[PDB]
Design a binder for this molecule. Structure first.
Ligand code: ZN
Lengths: 90, 69, 84, 240, 182, 70, 125, 166, 60
């Protein structure tokens, strides 16, 4: 509801806007209006899965927005594309 | 028997006589000239183009015949 | 912009009438979401206009080929009624 | 392997989508605090004292029903109310997901003939209540008629070339009328000589001569080569 | 009445309690919902007039094409129906069977021309206003909605003065002059 | 290209705005002119329909929203 | 709430609005007092509605008059028409209708151009 | 208390997302249908059998000589319905349809419209080769992408849309 | 006075090699052809999943 919608009001909008979050994916086309019933939740890792796809302790950013804030190369792509958009729109 | 309003309507012209059709669900009223028949809740269903006036209605119940004179 | 005179905008029918924040990580994250939103918007606008310019040539090619097929069918029924 | 993913109900009830950057397919666990197969679990927290409930990721490269689901079936018959007869249940690869998409109320009678996957299957089956392990050959449903009663969907992951007789005998014995039939057909194990949709045509015709009317088929091609999921219903009265 | 079964529906097809044949598709009911006609029989006291003028145009077409009684009375009737505004153009006598409608002789009524020139915004609200007694045509007030207007009087349809809807719209535009008492 | 050469249908580069008159730069050409003129036609057409509504105001224009509007 | 009345007044293109309400007897044209009204020779053309009938009828009302448009003489005729028919309308609504048609008799006996403007002109001879 | 503008109430005369686009076949290339190979399964129909008899071309040896592979002619029982309903002028076609080489399918659809049953159970599978002689059925088949169809003409069958015919 | 010809069209095998390569990558879009199975560890299908769409052929 609109009591945790403040905490999760961004991430569902970017999951709607996954089509341009990284210029290497091209997720297939669907609108994905925000559903009426959902739930956030984190993966937990298989105990034999180790060294391969487990994220570390101090690497576990406790929100998907913070995890996306993490890598400055992705943010660098955001910076260069937003800068060329700004100069071409002004 | 129980006090239950089913259809209560004041229609302005004169009504000579009226009757039920087969149930409480339909009743025909012989108005000033045209005979009308009505639903259970008071809506009208047919303004009879024939029965160009009416004074006495009756219903033959096994024949489903509304007879007017 | 669409500019209107005051003498005509002060005299018109009713229905057809032209009628706290945080400093820091919160606002930089909100501008971040604004960045990815305008990125997505300019991207799929590019996509949609590309599709429309594609169906431009689709329409033109289909139109000329149905034109020649319709004239071939009309000469077919022309000779069919001519062999009476 | 530690990021946060939202959940969403799928079209079929019981199965959920886990939309993140990539988007998984997932089911609601019967046995929390454990992973049977080696899959990843996504754990959510419901806020009363707060509960911690987990969701097992369904691997479409390891279970043909999950291949058919995200390849897109118009309808299953594995609803969260139903009972499911799983012919050819090898292990806890797919039967765990079918079990917990059925739920805590309804039973999945899983059958199996081989003994080593059977004993690890019953060791799986002690940890969730609603499945029934059978260690019999599927060719003789008479020798386990004692213990399964009137199932309302059958799934068939049997891979031996008398599939039509297998599913015909089991559906005649235990599948109730207007009930669901879901078949996974493997052309290289039916017969390798002739081609895939030729043997699919043969098996579809053997179904509709055994009066299982086939509604729907799917090739599931981006996940596995030369299988087909055929969904039909047991008509039993008025095939036409 | 029960959404009958298949054999019952086959055994009686011609039953319909709601819509008989002689209702003519309930067009009197439909157009009086369309134009918000208060009383019963108003449709048929229009339809009698419509049948009357097609009877008279029939007899005038029957009369031979040379005599002045026929030609004068047909141009006279055509001009009278233009002056009552039932038509819109002084068209051919074929429009005295294609164009005269009970819908048209309803369309010249007072609330529907009131909604037409946007005095009200719906015809139900127009019957509300002229049953509350706010409008007049020329000098005299109109109380009943059955007064249809002529071609002449589609111009002096205005409210009375001290009608507080007139006062509220003038004070909306703040041209509310109050020396003229409204 | 049916019966023509690439050097028959090559290219015709457009001349740029002069340097003498370069204070008000960007000489505009025919496609720029029609891009401006159809927009000006659109604005004049909506102004004309606005003036027509205005002179056919019919000042008995009453609704119920003229107690929120002022 | 407070009893008010708004009237108009028009010469050629000047327009005068008059808000008359119950008050203490102040007469203001655009905030300026009524005495400080140019062109100073038609100050009595402005004065004559409040001078024909006596200030005792003005003791309980106060008038604020906005004026737009027109030149000097058009503005002063608009002012006097607005003042006059504002006083008449206030007495028509809130007080004695007998005083209303007393005032109307006085103004119409002096000149009715102080109550009704002469709009519809010219003539094609 | 009395309401304004009342009408004599009559009956209201008026007021009383799983999309499916069928995916193209795994057997299909662009228009090649890479998964038909000998031995073929040849659907049959009524005008084909009648035309084959009046051209005196045998069924199985005619298909082998047309196509140079083992052909399994397949008659839907819904098309045997039409070949029965043609009447006693086609008893030759009937007792040549009854043939243990010609193994017969079983349909599941009300009525006996053999053309729609043929086009349906073809475009479900794209493994069959249609034998026919109907012009409209031929147009339906050569509209749908990439099955082969054959038809008798002259004194031998001819085969239309199959690549390895030689 | 020739048009611009092509090094691709110079070798009558290579253009059939280099247009079979396209026709491979064309029907990656038409159907979803098999690729080789589970390449890495299963970390999602990486391209989306939609609900209101079933790509399964129905039987009349
Ligand atoms: Zn059939």
């Amino acid at each position: 509801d609109d009591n945790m919608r403040r905490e999760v009001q961004r991430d569902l909008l970017l999951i709607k806007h996954r089509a341009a979050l990284d210029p290497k994916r091209h997720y297939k086309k669907q609108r994905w209006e925000v559903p009426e019933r959902f739930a956030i939740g984190t993966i937990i890792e298989d105990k034999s899965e180790f060294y391969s796809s487990r994220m570390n302790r101090k690497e576990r950013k406790s929100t998907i927005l913070e995890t996306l804030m993490g890598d400055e190369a992705s943010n660098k792509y955001f910076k260069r594309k937003y800068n060329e958009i700004q100069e071409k729109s002004t | 028997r129980k006090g239950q309003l089913r259809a209560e309507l004041f229609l302005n012209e004169t009504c000579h006589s009226a009757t039920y059709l087969q149930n409480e669900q339909y009743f025909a009223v012989a108005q000033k000239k045209y005979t009308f028949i009505y639903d259970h809740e008071g809506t009208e269903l047919h303004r009879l183009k024939q029965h160009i006036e009416a004074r006495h209605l009756d219903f033959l119940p096994y024949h489903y015949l509304l007879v007017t004179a | 912009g669409l500019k209107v005179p005051k003498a005509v905008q002060k005299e018109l029918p009713f229905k057809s009438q032209i009628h706290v924040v945080l400093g820091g990580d919160e606002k930089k994250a909100r501008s971040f979401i604004q960045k990815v939103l305008t990125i997505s918007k300019a991207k799929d606008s590019k996509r949609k206009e590309q599709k429309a310019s594609q169906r431009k040539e689709r329409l033109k090619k289909l139109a000329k080929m149905e034109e020649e097929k319709s004239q071939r069918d009309k000469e077919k029924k022309k000779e069919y009624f001519a062999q009476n | 392997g530690g990021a946060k993913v939202v959940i969403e109900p799928h079209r079929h009830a019981g199965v959920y989508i886990a939309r993140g950057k990539e988007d998984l397919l997932v089911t609601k666990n019967m046995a929390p605090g454990e992973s049977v197969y080696g899959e990843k679990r996504i754990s959510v927290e419901e806020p009363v004292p707060p509960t911690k409930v987990e969701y097992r990721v369904w691997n479409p490269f390891r279970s043909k029903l999950a291949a058919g689901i995200m390849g897109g079936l118009d309808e299953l018959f594995i609803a969260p109310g139903k009972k499911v007869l799983y012919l050819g249940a090898a292990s806890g690869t797919s039967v765990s997901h079918v079990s917990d998409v059925v739920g805590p109320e309804g039973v999945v009678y899983a059958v199996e003939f081989s003994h080593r996957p059977g004993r690890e299957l019953i060791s799986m089956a002690k940890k969730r209540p609603n499945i029934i392990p059978i260690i019999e050959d599927a060719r003789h449903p008479q020798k386990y008629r004692m213990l399964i009663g009137m199932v309302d969907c059958v799934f068939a992951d049997v891979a031996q070339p008398d599939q039509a007789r297998i599913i015909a005998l089991n559906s005649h014995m235990f599948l109730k009328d207007q009930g669901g039939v879901v078949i996974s057909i493997k052309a290289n194990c039916i017969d390798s000589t002739v081609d895939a949709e030729t043997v699919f045509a043969r098996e579809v015709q053997k179904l509709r001569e055994e009066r299982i009317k086939p509604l729907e088929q799917l090739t599931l091609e981006p996940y596995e080569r030369d299988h087909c999921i055929v969904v039909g219903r047991y008509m039993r009265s008025g095939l036409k | 009445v029960r959404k009958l079964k298949h054999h019952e529906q086959k055994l009686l097809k011609k039953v319909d309690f709601l819509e008989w044949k002689q209702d003519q598709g309930h067009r009197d009911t439909q157009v009086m919902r369309t134009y918000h006609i208060q009383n019963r029989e108003d449709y048929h006291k229009y339809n009698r007039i419509c049948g009357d003028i097609r009877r008279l145009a029939n007899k005038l077409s029957l009369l031979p094409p040379t005599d002045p009684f026929r030609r004068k009375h047909e141009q006279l009737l055509l001009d009278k129906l233009y002056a009552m505004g039932v038509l819109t153009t002084k068209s051919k006598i074929s429009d005295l069977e294609n164009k005269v409608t009970v819908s048209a002789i309803c369309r010249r009524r007072l609330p529907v021309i009131m909604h037409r020139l946007k005095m009200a915004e719906t015809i139900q609200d127009a019957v509300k206003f002229i049953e509350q007694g706010h409008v007049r045509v020329g000098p005299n007030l109109i109380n009943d909605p059955a007064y249809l207007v002529t071609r002449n009087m589609e111009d002096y349809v205005t409210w009375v003065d001290n009608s507080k809807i007139k006062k509220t719209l003038l004070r909306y535009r703040n041209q509310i002059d109050d020396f003229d008492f409204s | 290209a049916k019966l023509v050469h690439d050097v028959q249908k090559k290219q015709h580069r457009e001349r740029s705005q002069l340097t003498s008159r370069s204070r008000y730069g960007f000489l505009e050409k025919h496609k720029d002119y029609v891009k401006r003129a159809q927009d000006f036609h659109r604005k004049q057409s909506t102004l004309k329909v606005l003036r027509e509504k205005a002179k056919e105001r019919n000042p008995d224009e009453y609704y119920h929203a003229m107690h929120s509007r002022k | 709430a407070v009893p008010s009345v708004q009237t108009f007044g028009k010469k050629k293109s000047a327009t005068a609005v008059a808000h008359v309400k119950a008050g203490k007897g102040l007469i203001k044209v655009n905030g300026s007092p009524i005495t400080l009204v140019e062109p100073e020779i038609l100050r009595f053309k402005v004065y004559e509605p409040l001078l024909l009938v006596g200030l005792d009828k003005f003791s309980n009302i106060d008038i604020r008059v906005r004026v737009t448009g027109g030149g000097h003489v058009s503005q002063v005729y608009a002012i006097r028409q607005a003042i006059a028919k504002g006083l008449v309308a206030y007495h028509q609504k809130y007080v004695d209708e007998q005083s209303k048609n007393e005032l109307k008799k006085a103004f119409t006996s002096y000149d009715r151009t102080l109550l009704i403007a002469d709009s519809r002109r010219p003539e094609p001879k | 208390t009395r309401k304004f503008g009342l009408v004599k109430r009559t009956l209201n005369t008026k007021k009383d997302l799983t999309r499916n686009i069928p995916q193209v076949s795994s057997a299909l290339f662009f228009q090649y249908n890479q998964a038909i190979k000998p031995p073929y399964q040849v659907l049959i129909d009524t005008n084909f059998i009648n035309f084959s008899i009046q051209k005196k071309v045998d069924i199985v040896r005619g298909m082998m000589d047309c196509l140079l592979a083992k052909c399994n002619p397949l008659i839907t029982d819904c098309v045997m319905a039409e070949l029965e309903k043609l009447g006693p002028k086609y008893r030759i076609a009937l007792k040549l349809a009854r043939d243990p080489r010609i193994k017969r399918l079983s349909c599941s659809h009300k009525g006996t419209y053999a053309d729609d049953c043929l086009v349906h159970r073809v475009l479900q599978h794209k493994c069959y080769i249609v034998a026919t002689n109907d012009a409209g059925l031929k147009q339906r088949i050569r509209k749908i992408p990439g099955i082969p169809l054959m038809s008798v003409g002259g004194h031998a069958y001819v085969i239309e849309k199959l690549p390895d015919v030689f | 006075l020739t048009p611009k010809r092509n090094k691709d069209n110079r070798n009558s095998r290579v253009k059939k090699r280099k247009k079979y390569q396209k026709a491979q990558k064309k029907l990656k879009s038409v159907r979803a052809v098999y690729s080789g199975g589970q390449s890495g560890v299963y970390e999602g299908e990486k391209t989306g999943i939609k609900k209101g769409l079933t790509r399964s052929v129905k039987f009349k």
